[PDB]
Symmetry: C3
Subunit: 603 residues, 3 copies
């Protein structure tokens, strides 16, 4: 008579039935005769096996020595101070699933297609999450074999074997290629609060969420783990909530606070992460369905590595991704069509702020950042790229505005792109560089703003479309940089440039018997890659009345009348020399101005 | 003795009283004798009628055939997999309320006033949410009768009949006009998780939240619904949480994933939505209190329509709204003072990326977007506006930076504004266009960067304040666009322009007996609307020693001395022709440079 | 037999044990014999003293007359409509703790160091939150004694007495200085919903959260409180969730909606706040550990003050902070390295939009804002700074793009920096101003774009590095501003400027017997600080065939041949005067063009 089943709630259900509406870990611990001090792996596995859809957990530290694999929807409601101690062997892994349903049966055109045919659409319906995936190694990028092409789509309609999807294709895919079509069954794994402990030797990421869509995470915190703290893998449309994901293990091939692995449409609106290596690593792995990362937006994040790599990262399978209003030591720039904007970027100890080491092609945008440097920037420039493989598309570096701080040096560079000597063939595609927007630099010395060249001078020409360096500011009067450094590739026939205009005035005084009156040669603060265009004009001094023919003639009745023909008497990459050529030799010394303007505008 | 009321908790309350602290749907189902497989409409209505303030729901799919109207605060705590199936007839509608309390009694000045008098302030206190609303059709915009002016305010203080409000008025409102003052009693309708199913024929939006303030939504997901998936209506200060709101119905007048209806101070920080038509529609309807939308900020969202409209939208009652770091197919630009920045914008099949179809006035800012095009852009330009009604204020298109991708064509345009032939009267206000910031375009052909003209050439002049096209890049050597296309309106007397400077060098060699030495005519890559300003100078070749009088004279003792007077011998919209005029005919051929610069700077 | 302890759940725990898994306020009220209508202070204190880690609260208004001090982790789960009425005396204060563990033992270099030695690292481990703090008054800024230097760090590793930390130092700290090292034990204080009422006389902030890290707040709302609605103090890595924090009290020294006090790494992604004074105040106080604020990012917020101060604020202990896509009446700009971008900024009644009143040094970035003005801007410029103390570093104002609206006036200024007469010594560091990006201004009159000067003209020179005003637009034909206003400091020897180029054309007609043919003097729309560089060229009219020697010669066999030597005949700050000097006096009148270009480019 003393059972909860014998007690009647006013509704007519029993007290047992009231109790059954809420699942608690403690009832399971009692029933399974597992103490809260013992490994609870079998208990967590039993709760999920029982199909419990929401589990409340009392605040304790619990041993969890197993890898707990959630494959159905599950929600934790954990009290603060609930900690799962995975030791050397445990972890949580929450995953949806895929199946290969068909193959591609029409060609997909990058940035254009919104539909494709399949061999079999019988298992496809509107709203499905499909994966287009090429199983061929290097099919996205030549840098790593597992950089394979693909993307996630949501089905808009099916008509026969024609699948219309929302949006536009991010890549080209051919019928003739090994293109498989997967269908995803996503998981909805939820938690208000999840806090974990692992040793630095535990090879399991404390939490992985895999094949999930349309979600915002709860609070997550880890201590330990060998490789990464939190991984979001093959996820689609999600926001990362503020967290304490970290890695503090001895250096290995990963060491990531958060790893965003093969995800699409991923924001991180504010937070901080610290790691032995990358704090946020954007990349992934090489299993079936591990698509390139794209449409990433990280904002307001403070991201640091303890070793001399970058806090913020983009691997070579990452495109269409931005860090905005973030702080990082160093930065990696991914495949292309990526951006760092409004960021505070600290130079690495090994020189340079931004590295392009796995370039595929597209734009590399550096918009209104603040850069903090201290090295001479002689071995690595502020922004440095090394092309070791053929590009898929033309590469453009676009540095628009911002503030470059430091001392610089006689050999410092702002943007340098080199072809590796290991790429022993001419580069098919082109490089462009665009530096603009009133970016300032307080270096005491700077060798160049932009340079692009092969790794062996005179081996190959690196094709260049255009280089624009049109609106930059060196704040120090000792700085004397090239706008564009001259060498074979930057001087090749078809290269077009815009190089910042300069202008000035110089007072000259003619002397008796002059047939020319020449300013001294003018050494330009900013040097061009080649002799610039030069305009020279002559005019009166401020504070003097308007010239008439009496200024240069002793008697205006005497003809020919003397006039000052303005010319540029000498031009070099680094020099102009305004002068006057007289039509009759000077009799009376006169003081007046010569004006000049230099520039290059070829595209 | 077997009642929960007979069992004593250690606190001294009964077990029934413990149970009563938490409301569950299952107790209601039992007590009301409604099976969980039956329509639960009467149960939900009874729970809310009972004043339950927080309801826990067990994961099942529940039939809900009625429209459930929440008019008091209510909170759901739903297990994952809780689904409300509305079928053809059901939905949820959560609403606050309004009353008309008074009328406006002083004139309000746009961007200036922070107070207004009323006829009766007896029902107003500090902190109240008031609505200023004009009941007269077309009082905000001439495009649709229900585009009526008004705004939401919060009261800062009341002194007699003077209401001081926080902020500054967004519009002008006159005593003499039909201006009513409403007071809002907001609802606080909450959910952790809400997932719904409706047929595509169900005319109810699955969830509407109306007259709520100061909130962040929980997770929401719908399948089905005829018109829209989620509507936020007459809401004030809110953030939209990530969701799966959608529409997939046959095309009708709406088909919106999320509709933001008549809202003020509305962010959406990351997400994705797909719809038959607009994914996010910003607009609303025409009931009392349906103010213009303003102060919208959507960030990090991927927004697509299946039909050839736009994923991202702004209707003609929308101002002060931005999409930033979003992706969309096509784009609508609302009333004015709106922006798309840092967006990926795909061209519609029907040509063009951005449409201004209900313009009221103000700025239309396109900042650092990437545009993906494939059509010839001959019928609709990249950015295209049609003025069919008088503007309320001058209209400015400001395209600052970015990357324009595609092939273009011989008739392609970047920015075109036309007056409709249906507006058979001269336009009162002005149009301005400002294209700057180093925006690039890789078209093989382009007709113009900017053009503004009436729909019948020579009918009316469209007034233009200024057109600036000062810093653009056509990357292809085949492109030969007008900066500003010349026609009646762009050439009218009072129009002021800035048109990008060009410059170059040409080597010339004089011939024996020349009295002039003329470069061949130079055809400019970028064409002006009218003959540009031209500067010509003469100078030495690189690699040659500084000129003296011996360069152009066989014997410098013989006077007059020959000098090279530099001139521009011919000017056209598209041509310059530097030359030298000699003061005595040439005896010795000489090779030297002529330099030129063109530009227009009128404002 | 009627105890919950006598009833057995199916798990084997008693019904009392089931009940004990959830804490409710109502059980405490019963057991403590406190009615829900009485002061519940003793009940809240007992719940927290009992170590309850999660408390559920039924919706009622509860009297709380005490200041409830949470010093251990605590979580509320409050029903909507739960209100804590603090009256005149109550409040909530949730705090972590600190201890001074050691002192600094090596010098730290701003923007460079990532490690420091301590006197004792025995209490330090990896992951610890440490505070570096200088106890000396004015050690961050000279404006207020409690502006002391320091920062928060997280430990990466400890080796002996060497502490490596994540990131890079934000300031310099010397061994020799009074630099203490604190260790923080943070609190995790959580709530879903917290709504409070206080009188306007209650000196307690309704909620303070102090010494917490890695969190996102829940929903918070207050009515009342004398000084501020919500304070986040000495917090590290957090996001502020949307809220209704406010202040409506009579003006005092604070009156803040939200006060961010001495915090680091703080985002606010969307919201609205209203206050008597600042809506969001960023600053803090002067206790041990009250570091400068840094790494703030507020986005999508509508922020207003009722009095004529600013809605958005940054005090003089704030650096590295941005408001983006926000709306405010007026704005304060903090210490430096701060930004307002993409904001709508309303002019205060007392003139001006943006105030720099406690400058320390660094950049003050105003990027793409829209400014709404109505005063003549004669007493305070749009952007105005007053230097009353020595700067720590050079100060740069960088106004890049945007839209300046209003009438202006004959004395209006855009950027003005003045040295106070109260600073009766020469300023050590420099001021720079950079105005660019195509910023527009629709004023009918404007005196200057940029001016920097001492408070007594001719007393001291304010050192200026550079002033650039290179790309601005006055849309009105009546506006005639100086680019840079000329006075002692802006004209001093070492000052370098870039001042926007101008150019034009004028047709002239020679007359019989001319020895010169002079255009009338040209009055420049934009005036320079000093006589500009001037280029003059001569050329043919549009529509005329290419010039040859016949244009200026009646018989080309007669030598010398007449040629038109182009010159600038007069230059002033505000004037040019193109002319031709003839080598033989004119016989036949000719009509032709003179062209001119002006500019200054000195850095
Ligand atoms: C747990 C373990 O030890 N696994 C072995 C390891 O597996 C590798 C392999 O699957 C590659 C393709 O992915 C993972 O390592 C990447 C890593 O994700 C980073 N890449 C990107 C784009 O973010 C990093 O930069 O590169 C490594 C890498 O290429 O090794 C994965 N590692 C882990 C720890 O999960 O290696 C191999 C193997 O054959 O090389 C087999 C095991 O599964
Ligand atoms: C449920 C229904 O069928 N209602 C009928 C429909 O009502 C219209 C009407 O209230 C207008 C003013 O608003 C709604 O339609 C708008 C719609 O919100 C969009 N506008 C904006 C600015 O976002 C769209 O672009 O235009 C339509 C429109 O103008 O029709 C509302 N429709 C719905 C489905 O709620 O039409 C009428 C009627 O008299 O025209 C009456 C019914 O209430
Ligand atoms: C509750 C109270 O009345 N406290 C007295 C008050 O305390 C001041 C003092 O601690 C200063 C350093 O901080 C607080 O006032 C600041 C305030 O935070 C703002 N500053 C910034 C940078 O945000 C504001 O602009 O300035 C005031 C100020 O300097 O007074 C604090 N006030 C409060 C209400 O907490 O004053 C004194 C005192 O000796 O001056 C003692 C009391 O603790
Ligand atoms: Cl004169
Ligand atoms: Cl002569
Ligand atoms: Cl020489
Ligand atoms: Cl001709
Ligand atoms: Na710019």
């Amino acid at each position: 008579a003393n059972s909860a089943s014998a007690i009647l709630d006013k509704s007519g259900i029993s007290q047992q039935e009231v109790n059954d509406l809420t699942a608690h870990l403690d009832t399971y611990l009692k029933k399974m005769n597992i103490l809260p001090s013992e490994d609870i792996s079998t208990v967590l596995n039993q709760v999920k096996s029982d199909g419990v859809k929401k589990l409340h957990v009392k605040s304790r530290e619990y041993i969890v020595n197993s890898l707990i694999e959630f494959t159905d929807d599950f929600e934790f409601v954990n009290e603060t101070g609930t900690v799962f101690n995975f030791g050397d062997t445990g972890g949580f892994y929450a995953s949806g699933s895929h199946t290969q349903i068909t193959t591609l049966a029409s060609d997909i055109v990058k940035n254009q297609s919104q539909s494709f045919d399949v061999a079999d659409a019988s298992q496809i319906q509107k709203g499905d999450w499909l994966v287009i995936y090429c199983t061929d190694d290097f099919s996205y990028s030549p840098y790593r074999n597992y950089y394979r092409k693909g993307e996630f789509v949501e089905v808009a309609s099916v008509s026969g074997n024609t699948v219309k999807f929302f949006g536009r294709a991010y890549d080209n895919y051919l019928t003739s290629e090994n293109i498989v079509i997967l269908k995803v069954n996503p998981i909805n794994f939820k938690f208000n609060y999840l806090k974990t402990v692992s040793t630095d030797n535990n090879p399991n990421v404390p939490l992985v969420i895999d094949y999930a869509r349309n979600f915002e995470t709860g609070y997550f915190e880890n201590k330990g783990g060998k490789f990464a703290g939190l991984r979001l893998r093959r996820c689609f449309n999600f926001n990362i909530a503020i967290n304490s994901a970290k890695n503090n293990a001895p250096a290995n091939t990963l060491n990531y606070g958060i790893q965003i692995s093969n995800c699409q449409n991923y924001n991180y609106f504010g937070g901080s992460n610290n790691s032995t290596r990358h704090a946020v690593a954007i990349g992934g792995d090489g299993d079936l369905g591990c698509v390139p990362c794209r449409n990433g937006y990280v904002s307001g994040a403070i991201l640091h590595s303890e070793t001399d790599t970058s806090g913020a990262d983009m691997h070579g399978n990452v495109e269409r991704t931005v860090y905005d209003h973030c702080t990082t030591n160093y930065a990696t720039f991914g495949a292309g069509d990526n951006e760092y904007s409004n960021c505070d970027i600290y130079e690495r100890e090994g020189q340079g702020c931004v590295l392009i080491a796995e370039p595929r092609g597209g734009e590399f945008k550096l918009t209104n950042n603040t850069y903090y440097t201290k090295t001479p920037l002689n071995s690595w420039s502020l922004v440095h790229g090394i092309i070791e493989k053929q590009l898929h598309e033309d590469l453009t570096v676009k540095l628009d505005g911002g503030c470059i701080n430091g001392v610089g040096g006689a050999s410092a560079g702002i943007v340098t792109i080199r072809q590796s000597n290991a790429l022993n063939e001419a580069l098919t595609k082109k490089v462009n560089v665009h530096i603009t927007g009133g970016v300032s630099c307080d270096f005491d010395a700077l060798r160049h703003w932009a340079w692009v060249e092969d790794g062996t001078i005179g081996r190959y020409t690196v094709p260049i479309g255009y280089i624009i360096v049109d609106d930059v500011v060196n704040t120090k009067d000792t700085a004397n940089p090239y706008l564009i450094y001259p060498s074979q590739s930057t001087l090749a026939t078809n290269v077009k440039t815009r190089q910042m205009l300069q202008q000035g005035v110089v007072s000259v005084t003619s002397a008796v018997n002059n047939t020319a009156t020449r300013a001294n040669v003018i050494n330009l603060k900013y040097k061009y890659s080649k002799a610039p265009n030069v305009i020279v004009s002559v005019g009166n001094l401020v504070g003097s009345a308007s010239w008439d023919a009496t200024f240069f003639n002793e008697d205006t009745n005497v003809e020919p009348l003397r006039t000052p023909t303005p010319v540029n008497s000498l031009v070099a990459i680094d020099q102009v020399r305004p002068a006057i050529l007289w039509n009759k030799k000077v009799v009376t010394p006169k003081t007046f101005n010569l004006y000049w303007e230099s520039g290059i505008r070829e595209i």
